[PDB]
Amino acid sequence: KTLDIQSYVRDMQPGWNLGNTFDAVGQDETAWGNPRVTRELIEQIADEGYKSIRIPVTWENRIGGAPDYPIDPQFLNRVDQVVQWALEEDLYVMINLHHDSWLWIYEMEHNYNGVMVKYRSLWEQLSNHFKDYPTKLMFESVNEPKFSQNWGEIRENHHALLDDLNTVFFEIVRQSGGQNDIRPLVLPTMETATSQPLLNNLYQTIDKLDDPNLIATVHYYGFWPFSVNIAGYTRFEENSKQEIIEAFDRVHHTFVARGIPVVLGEFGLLGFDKHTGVIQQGEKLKFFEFLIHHLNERDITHMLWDNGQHFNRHTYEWYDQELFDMMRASWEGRSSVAESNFIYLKQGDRIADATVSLQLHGNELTGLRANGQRLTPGQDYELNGERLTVKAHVLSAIASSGTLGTNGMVTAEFNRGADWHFRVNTYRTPVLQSTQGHVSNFSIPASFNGNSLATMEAVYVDGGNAGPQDWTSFKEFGYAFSPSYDANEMKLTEAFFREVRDGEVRLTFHFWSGETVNYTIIKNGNQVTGIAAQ
Amino acid sequence: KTLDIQSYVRDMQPGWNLGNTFDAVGQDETAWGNPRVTRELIEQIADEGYKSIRIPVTWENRIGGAPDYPIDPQFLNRVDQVVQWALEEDLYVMINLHHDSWLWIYEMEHNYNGVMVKYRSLWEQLSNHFKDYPTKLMFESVNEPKFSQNWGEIRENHHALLDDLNTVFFEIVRQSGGQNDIRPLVLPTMETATSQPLLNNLYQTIDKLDDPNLIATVHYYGFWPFSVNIAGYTRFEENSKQEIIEAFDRVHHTFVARGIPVVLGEFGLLGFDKHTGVIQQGEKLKFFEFLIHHLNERDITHMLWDNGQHFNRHTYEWYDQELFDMMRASWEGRSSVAESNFIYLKQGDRIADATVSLQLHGNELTGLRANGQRLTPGQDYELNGERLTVKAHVLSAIASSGTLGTNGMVTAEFNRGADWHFRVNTYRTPVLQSTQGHVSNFSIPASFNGNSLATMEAVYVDGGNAGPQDWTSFKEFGYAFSPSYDANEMKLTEAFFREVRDGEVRLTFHFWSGETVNYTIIKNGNQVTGIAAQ
């Protein structure tokens, strides 16, 4: 019968990626540290409220040679089993060719027929294998296509190559029998990026194919500097907000408003490829709240990129319940947020009233708790417009001990959406110590003293920015440096030193409390002298 | 072994089309009035100096139905026989899908897979059939592709469709075995037109395919108004000259100069689709001289469109030896031409010296003949710069009788290139007569009195142009009107009257002698009254 492609895509909301699994580059799907897929994982993801699952698959390393490129039947049966489990749990399912994109498909520019033969063979095999599967199984032509080994090197000829890949995929699937005459097909922009020319090119391809069951796909990992924590973008601010609005306005105008539905096939923050701790927690939450709201406004179905770091695949729970709670709330509507998820108290100072700005997002404050205890309006706190004041005696009750670090929590409750949690932290000025070391393993002894590090600047004392990405003084969190809180050390990485010339560099460590600490390093070959502020 | 595609295309020069033959829409190749192809025709064309032959083929009407679309083997064997004869005569050969373009291929926009299945099947069959043939046989994907039933309705989506047709053709041929891995392939622009965007799109496709044996093709039928004789363009003038220069500069810059050779797969004058007499003979000759010179300058191989009207296929000679002689001369270099191919003498007037402007094109005048008799320089004629004077006594010797029409010829001989022939014509004022008739068969009795008609204007006496193409007063020769010299009649066609409203129209007949005659028609329904000048 007829299929309503817009309703189909709407019914997928929200989605989840089985990341770093069948897409892993290796003998099998455990190559990147995830376990073999259990039925329970799929059940649990469905129970959390996900309505669709993307199962990215890298076929390279599980296929024979030319000319037929036979897919390993054992590998295919394992992929198949997971597809079936998902369908049994009433999920929509998307499969693709994944890291094949940069393992070999990218060669197409100087190997047209060679790539085409291999690509055709794979999609002929998959389309045939899955032809009688329910149409809740959809096919995606290729992940993040590009035709250079590098990102951001899209040339004019590349667009034509991607049109051809998308088109041959369409032709193969549509004429392969079973339900494949109507099965929804997912087609990407170049690099799954959102610039207007790339959206236009995908539109041209979709328009040409003259088919009612096509879905456009893009990916999104945040405004780059915020997403990796570089260049001073420690807060979710106007640049990150405007990129989302502008990008998804383009997507909506070009596709959704013209009747072509859009699946955001992957989203997250790029810096999570390091770890989730590289983005300040409150700012991370506000990114997800804002993004998902604006996707909802534009009818865009989204699928979380989860490489194993969000849903714990061994215990079937979220590593970060706060993040999940925010996402789950965002599926339904907006949550109120605040300038920060913390209130800092200087150890030794008289504790005063803390006033913080809320962004209510159309909700009302219903209550406040201090370590779970209900507070009395007026007596213990005030809300004046969007200015929330937590009274001194409440903070003193939580943190009069003056123990450094997080003493407790003030939780703001709203009539709709997720609670917002203020971590109440006692701090003193952090102290770094002079030291001497080697570029391969350089650690500054550091007393964090209840502080959390936001970012680090590096400049040559003689002038100019030092280290990687020297268009900015603010170095990249994790990549160039890392706080080791348990070890009481500040790590400066070998990658940092690889892009530092011999000489004297001034470091400036910025902490979330507002504390700033300077430090000097002198590099002489592979040897580094650290000198604390005096 | 390796093939040098530029040398290959150069070696094709000059070419000839076996037109209105296998391309004819009908049961067989005689459907449009040409005889079955004889070996002698191919021999004779080769003997005239042609090095390549285009054999356009329309496959529709000689194929089975879906899904395999089997080509009639009998038809294919007849095409094959002609290909073999041409190859035996050492010619290069181009075959294609021809009027399939507008019989069904154009449907692709709203029938993507249906057209693709049929197109794929045909090229699979042809590529297989011809795979072991010498590489002097080349394949051309499709004639004059477009995706509307009408010309000049190229939309953005159409470019993508043509890229796909060209690309699938490439893929099929290149992987079909025999010599087809290296066989030269000919790819057209949309409508085989020469505008920059269309040239760019073909370049993009050729660049993408990353193959050393690709040939670009365009067609050319002259600046439109001159080519059909409308809007007053009775002379080969600056607009026709500039179109050639601009168009082929674009072609050279975009393709030839970048190492992609170009075959002009068809050329002629569009109006020849009526008959060759619609273009004044001298102006026709200058068009071909100028065109072929500029193609030579730009290394473009050309193939004459001959639907049966140039080379007489029954007697194996040129209908118009003067035209052939000009083309043959042009293969080697430029010919000198003149303002006209005629000298008019008014009957009853004293015969004076005739002075005409020559365009020497780098040649020198070596002599002059009057009816074949060598004339004496100085005594009988003078050349002053490019001004040729033929003395009165020479013209009087040719035309003292005062018989109306062509009395004889003055032939200019040059050190290089074709002779130029001046027809010496005696004329009197032409006379049209009043009459009454019907729109389906309206003839003005006409005493042409040694004159040749150039064009006819039609305007409403109250204002505005009358008849077809009413953006100009000058009507289209043949289509709207025709001189019947033997019948002594001026025909105004039914097609003319279909676009004339009831009322009074002033006609102005322009003759090559400079004589102008006005005439009035009054249209009342299907009845027409003609009133001669008084």
Ligand SMILES: C[As](C)(=O)[O-]
């Ligand atoms: C390294 As990625 C663009 O697959 O998140």
Ligand SMILES: C[As](C)(=O)[O-]
């Ligand atoms: C009518 As034609 C464009 O094939 O000369």
Ligand SMILES: [Ca+2]
């Ligand atoms: Ca294409």
Ligand SMILES: [Ca+2]
């Ligand atoms: Ca609540």
Ligand SMILES: [Ca+2]
């Ligand atoms: Ca001569």
